[PDB]
């Protein structure tokens, strides 16, 4: 399904990164957040859901999903409740180009989503899948 | 034209919001940033450019665009350098009391703006998909 996303967490340098993968295309959205809390997780999901047509988000079902605020954000937005390693590999390639981990993460996202073999990139695949579904 | 974005700033509650509009569709990306500085502006653009095929960003060419950091980020990413602000502030005001923090209310407004019905979110994907084809 075009509307299905997988949310995971990963850890580098003592910081938390949330990674949302559009399962059909491999497109990712990722961000450093200050703590793996419900409130931070709810905000990240609200942000995502405003940018793409997010129907279902499969999560790890851990401590930051048991509370009131993810549930309220997901309700509001109508969301029903390898890659970490790949992304850390790219972050390592660019890390020294940035002062702050957050910048390196976004460079990695860029790389991941625009890389192509000649065929298409993940950014191209997500648009093609959502447009075919519209 | 599919690759063209307009970046503007707007101000509420003494905070700074950056708004990127995909000109052909009206789709928006917006967020609250801590100050209207080069470094914050560069980071917002880097983020955007990783998510959409951004060729050209039209900016207001003000103080946060004259420096080294924005130039470096745009280079790297291959980016060449009032109704909407007012629309977004209107929506923000409708949801404001539903959120503790302005930042949340902004993202609720983004959601509303982009999904209101085609929607803007539907239009941007259609335009980019037709371009890749």
């Amino acid at each position: 399904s075009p509307g299905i996303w997988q949310l995971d967490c990963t850890h580098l340098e003592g910081k938390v990164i949330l990674v949302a993968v559009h399962v059909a295309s491999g497109y990712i959205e990722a961000e450093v957040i200050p703590a793996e809390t419900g409130q931070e997780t709810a905000y990240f999901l609200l942000k995502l859901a405003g940018r793409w047509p997010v129907k279902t988000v499969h999560t790890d079902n851990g401590s930051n999903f048991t509370g009131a605020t993810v549930r309220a954000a997901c309700d509001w937005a109508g969301i029903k409740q390898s890659m970490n390693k790949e992304l850390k590999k790219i972050i390592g390639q660019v890390r020294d180009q940035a002062e702050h981990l957050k910048t390196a993460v976004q460079m990695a996202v860029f790389i991941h989503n625009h890389k192509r073999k000649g065929g298409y990139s993940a950014g191209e695949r997500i648009v093609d899948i959502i447009a075919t579904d519209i | 034209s599919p690759g063209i974005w307009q970046l503007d700033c707007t101000h509420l509650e003494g905070k700074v919001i950056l708004v990127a509009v995909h000109v052909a569709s009206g789709y928006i990306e917006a967020e609250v940033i801590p100050a209207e500085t080069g470094q914050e502006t560069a980071y917002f653009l880097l983020k955007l450019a990783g998510r959409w095929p951004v060729k050209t960003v039209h900016t207001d060419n003000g103080s946060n665009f004259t420096g080294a950091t924005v130039r470096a980020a745009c280079d790297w990413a291959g980016i060449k350098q009032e109704s909407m602000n007012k629309e977004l502030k209107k929506i923000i005001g409708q949801v404001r009391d539903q959120a503790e923090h302005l930042k949340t209310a902004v993202q609720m407004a983004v959601f509303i703006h982009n999904h209101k019905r085609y929607s803007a979110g539907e239009r941007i994907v259609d335009i980019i998909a037709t371009d890749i084809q």
Binding site: Q39, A42, Y43, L46, G67, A68, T69, R71, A72, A73, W76 | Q98, A99, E100, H101, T104, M108
Partner: peptide
């Protein structure tokens, strides 16, 4: 119950 603090 706010969207960021329920």
């Amino acid at each position: 119950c706010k969207i960021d603090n329920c």
